[PDB]
Design a binder for this molecule. Structure first.
Ligand code: HEM
Ligand SMILES: Nc1cc(N)nc(N)n1
Length: 292
């Protein structure tokens, strides 16, 4: 029964949001020591996904619109352990630009991180509006990592994502790493973990993977190169339909970039009704493109 209409922050336009993008991007460059010099890019991408991934297509609950991660129930979701680091990073940004909504800020943080890490451009639309504490979705809507391809496929149907969209989105697991204290998994998915590339797919196909137990007594796939895959990551090469798509992205960087950009924008916009006369999506310039 539930409609969330995008409403542009009063009087704001592209230039306002480019300023917010720039402040996030400059801080990404500045605060470079975080997580053993990985920097904040990966955790900001994960934050944007987790605030969006609570969405349920069946009743339009959850989703990025309401900015509900700011409330303790969601902030404290065991599935969100570690994301507090991303939230703290964004605090001074919100202080400088207090007019931006929380959902706009969290989602823009993810777009900025992807682009600054040399990923694809992600078109982004403003107008998410903060909603009250009672609209916060319950814990348990984000996915488990110990499961198989059938679980992944069914899970993502709730977010209206198909096989191609799922495999494209999972390529973000090239970024950052798993941390034992956060999730019960430990290690990175590859070498270039603060640069956005198609390495996730190459590593799935090319590494010699061993099913091992980590120090939290959970199974994960490890390679001699020091990379790891979650059981749900590895499921993408166990299922024949996912495997074909993995091979496609391993062999076509541009196609992966284009498909990721579409799926990630869609993820960040699920649940939102944009008026016919809403502004077109914004495509922000990187700091590099601006000579900044
Ligand atoms: C089946 C679906 C997925 C599962 C089970 C899953 C699970 C996980 C787990 C367990 C971690 C480690 C968290 C930690 O220990 O800090 C992680 C990290 C991460 N995830 Fe996912 N994830 C999924 C999909 C996605 C998607 C769709 C995206 C975004 C498009 C994403 C982006 C990330 C990023 C960037 C990190 C690294 C964060 C950091 O380095 O701090 N994941 N994921
Ligand atoms: N988030 C990540 C990063 C990474 N390097 N590997 C995996 N499996 N997941």
């Amino acid at each position: 029964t539930l409609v969330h209409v995008a409403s542009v922050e009063k009087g704001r336009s592209y230039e306002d949001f480019q300023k917010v993008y720039n402040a996030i991007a400059l801080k990404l460059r500045e605060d470079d020591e975080y997580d053993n010099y990985i920097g904040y890019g990966p955790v900001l991408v994960r934050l944007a996904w987790h605030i969006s991934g609570t969405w349920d297509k069946h009743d339009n609950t959850g989703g990025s619109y309401g900015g509900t991660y700011r409330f303790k129930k969601e902030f404290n979701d065991p599935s969100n352990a570690g994301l507090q680091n991303g939230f703290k990073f964004l605090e001074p940004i919100h202080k400088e630009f207090p007019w931006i909504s929380s959902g706009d800020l969290f989602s823009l943080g993810g777009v900025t991180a992807v682009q600054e890490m040399q990923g694809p451009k992600i078109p982004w639309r403003c107008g998410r509006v903060d909603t009250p504490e009672d609209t916060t979705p319950d814990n348990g809507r984000l996915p488990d990592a110990d499961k198989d391809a059938g679980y992944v496929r069914t899970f993502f149907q709730r977010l209206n994502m198909n096989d191609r969209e799922v495999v494209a989105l999972m390529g973000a697991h090239a970024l950052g790493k798993t941390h034992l204290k956060n999730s019960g998994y430990e290690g990175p998915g590859g070498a270039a973990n603060n640069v956005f590339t198609n390495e996730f797919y190459l590593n799935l196909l090319n590494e010699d993977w061993k099913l091992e137990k980590n120090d939290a007594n959970n199974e994960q796939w490890d390679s001699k190169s020091g990379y790891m895959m979650l059981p749900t990551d590895y499921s993408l090469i166990q299922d024949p339909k996912y495997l074909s798509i993995v091979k496609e992205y391993a062999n076509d960087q541009d196609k992966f970039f284009k498909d990721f950009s579409k799926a990630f924008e869609k993820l960040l916009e699920d649940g939102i009704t944009f008026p016919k006369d809403a502004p077109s999506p914004f495509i922000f310039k990187t700091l590099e493109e601006q000579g900044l």
